[PDB]
Every structure is written in structure tokens, then in C-alpha cells.
């Protein structure tokens, strides 16, 4: 008939987080699930009305609906400062292919309203490509856009287990592109892969290979908006690095000749890879391996800005350079605790670049399971 839930979590990147939802399982006999969910962390507030139906057709074609609001404070996510308030809708159809494959396609509308932008080169390059020319010596600005998107996705999942896998692979490819008539003109592609290779019969020793890629660019002279940027560094990409520090840094314009900074801005291209040796946990019985997991890892990644105009800023790093690969090594520990899914890592960033920030200890308690 229905349910509701409340969650409290914690992350080094996100601080204390809260979650809350309420779902009506069958709306007046339609078979659609209607719900309201909300989440809040140090830099993000998000709320949505959800409409879902796993059997839109009796075959198993799914429908997924959204009407959302989102409030992003970029400085609290350790980026060069800006604020983005947005709302919109999405409709998505899910087509199962076989046990291990699904496809999804959908249409999206999103209104984005940008304010409180701290003048810096890359952000202003995008603004200029959009016909925007706000003052460079002033943080009281405003840019509002309406976009319509076509979204597509592909998920391969043959993990033997959803939680603490020991064998198989997981691949998720997402795409989106603006439909003419949008203010923006851009596409964005994301690729995530995870492969688990057990080396012993009992599956207590596993080799994990993770990669994560992202590429987007503008069309017809526009650039991809910077609030769609990829980032890297943190607890889920390159451990041992401060969240999102990897990649370009803001080149700030003077307030009222530019200022090199160590404030990350993300980029439109990204590549992250990790090799991780899963092993039994010292001082713990392998009866708890489904609930406790130790691993040693080698993380690497880079983020870059393909449109950095190096000609015009010779005195500053060429942030279009994709070859400054950050690297770290360390040890992680996960635990299905009474307080919820728990992840503690200690890692040392042994290859880092000008302006990158370290965060050796990183901790996360989930609020959804």
C-alpha cells in the first residue's frame, strides 16, 4: 500500500546528510508508484516527485518519471564559487534485453539559474560562448537557461552479488544531448566499469578493476556548461585526494593580472582508473566477508579542459593537458554496520600536481540502506 523512510549519513566530502521519502505503492489502481523524496548535504539540496511503473507494458518495459528541484552551492563542494538553482522533469522508458543488459531512453527538461559566480577564466569562456558578458570584477550576476535533452543509457550488470561482489562485471554508459530549441547546445557521455576477478575458490581474495570516463563538448560554438563538468578526487574516484581537487584550477579575474589559484573547477574530459586487491580482514572471521571487506588499492585519474585557450594565457598552466595523471595508494575498509554501510580509507597521494589538495583519511556512512 505504501511506506516512508528517513536517513542520516556522513561523508568527508558531504558532511552530515539527511534523506526522507514517502511512497504510495499503487495509485488508485493504476499500477504507478507515486512518491516524494528529499536529500540534503553540505553543498546540495534535492527534492523530487517520483512516478514509476516496473510494468508499463506487461512485457516489463518500465516507465520512470521525475519533477525535481535542486540547489547546488559550489564552494561547499570545494569548487570555485557559484550557486545553481534548477528544476525540471524527466520521462524515461526502461527496456530489459536479457538478464544482464538493459537500455533506457528519455526526454528531459531542466531550468538552470546561475548566480554568485566568482569571475574566473574558464567559467567566463563558457559564458562568452553563450552570448553572456557579465562583469569580471563582480560576483553579483545571473544567467538563466531552459534546456530540453534526449537521454539514453546502457547498463550491463553480471555481478554475482549487489553488495560486496566477488565475480563479474558492471558497465554503465549514459548519454545526453540537447534538442534544438534549448539555450545550451552540448552532449555529455559517461562510462563506468567494474570487474571482479576471484583468484581463490572460496572467493575471499578478489581483484577489482574500476574505470570511469567522461567526455562532453559544446556544439556550434557553445561550450558545455561548467555545472555539467566532470570532477575527480575523493572517496569514490581517486582516494587520498580532496573531493574534486583533480584537474583544472580557477584562474580568477581581479575584483574592483589574473590570479592563479588552487580552487578546482572540474573539466569536460575525465578518466579515472583503480586497481584494488580485495582480501580477508585482519582480526575478523571470513564468515563476515559478506558484511566486512578489506582492500588495498592503486587509484589514478585526471580531469582536463579541452577548450583551455593556452594561446591567451601562456603564463598559466595549460589545463587542456590530459597527461597529468594523479595517483595514490592506500587501504580501504567497508562494513555493513548497525549505523549503515560504512567505508573508511587511508591513502597517500604519491603523484600530485601544482594546486592539488590531499585528504588522506576519508569516511562515509550511507543513509539509503
Amino acid at each position: 500500500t505504501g511506506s516512508f523512510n528517513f536517513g542520516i549519513g556522513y561523508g568527508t566530502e558531504s558532511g552530515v546528510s539527511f534523506q526522507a521519502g514517502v511512497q504510495q505503492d499503487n495509485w488508485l489502481g493504476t499500477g504507478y508508484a507515486v512518491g516524494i523524496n528529499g536529500t540534503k548535504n553540505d553543498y546540495q539540496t534535492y527534492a523530487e516527485l517520483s512516478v514509476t511503473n516496473p510494468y508499463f507494458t506487461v512485457d516489463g518495459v518500465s516507465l520512470g518519471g521525475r519533477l525535481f528541484y535542486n540547489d547546488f552551492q559550489a564552494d561547499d563542494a570545494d569548487l570555485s564559487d557559484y550557486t545553481n538553482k534548477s528544476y525540471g522533469t524527466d520521462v524515461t522508458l526502461g527496456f530489459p534485453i536479457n538478464e544482464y543488459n538493459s537500455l533506457r531512453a528519455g526526454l528531459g527538461y531542466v531550468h538552470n539559474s546561475l548566480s554568485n559566480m566568482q569571475p574566473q577564466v574558464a567559467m567566463w569562456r563558457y559564458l562568452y560562448s553563450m552570448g553572456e558578458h557579465p562583469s569580471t570584477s563582480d560576483q553579483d550576476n545571473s544567467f538563466k537557461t531552459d534546456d530540453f535533452t534526449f537521454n539514453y543509457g546502457w547498463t550491463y550488470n553480471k555481478l554475482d552479488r549487489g553488495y560486496f561482489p566477488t565475480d563479474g562485471s558492471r558497465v554503465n554508459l549514459t548519454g545526453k544531448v540537447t534538442i534544438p530549441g534549448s539555450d545550451n547546445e552540448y552532449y555529455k557521455v559517461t562510462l563506468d566499469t567494474a570487474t571482479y576477478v576471484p583468484i581463490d575458490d572460496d572467493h575471499k581474495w578478489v581483484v577489482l578493476g574500476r574505470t570511469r570516463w567522461g567526455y562532453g563538448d559544446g556544439l556550434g560554438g557553445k561550450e558545455m556548461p561548467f555545472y555539467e563538468n566532470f570532477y575527480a578526487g575523493g572517496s569514490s574516484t581517486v582516494r587520498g585526494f580532496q573531493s574534486n581537487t583533480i584537474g583544472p584550477k580557477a584562474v580568477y579575474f581581479p575584483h574592483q593580472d589574473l590570479s592563479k589559484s588552487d580552487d578546482a573547477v572540474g573539466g569536460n574530459a575525465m578518466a579515472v582508473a583503480s586497481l584494488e586487491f580485495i582480501t580477508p580482514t585482519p582480526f575478523i572471521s571470513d564468515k563476515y566477508a559478506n558484511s566486512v571487506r578489506t582492500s588495498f588499492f592503486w587509484d589514478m585519474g585526471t580531469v582536463w579542459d579541452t577548450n583551455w585557450d593556452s594561446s591567451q594565457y601562456s603564463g598559466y598552466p595549460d589545463y587542456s593537458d590530459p597527461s597529468n595523471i594523479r595517483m595514490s595508494a592506500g587501504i580501504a575498509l567497508q562494513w555493513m554496520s548497525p549505523l549503515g554501510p560504512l567505508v573508511f580509507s587511508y591513502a597517500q597521494p604519491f603523484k600530485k600536481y601544482d594546486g592539488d589538495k590531499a585528504e588522506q583519511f576519508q569516511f562515509n556512512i550511507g543513509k539509503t540502506w
Binding site: 505504501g2 511506506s3 516512508f4 523512510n5 528517513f6 542520516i8 534523506q19 550511507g366
Partner: peptide, 7 residues
């Protein structure tokens, strides 16, 4: 942590 309550 996540508390769930079917109504």
C-alpha cells in the same frame, strides 16, 4: 542509517 516504516 536508514529507518523504513511501511504504513
Amino acid at each position: 542509517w536508514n529507518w523504513s516504516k511501511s504504513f
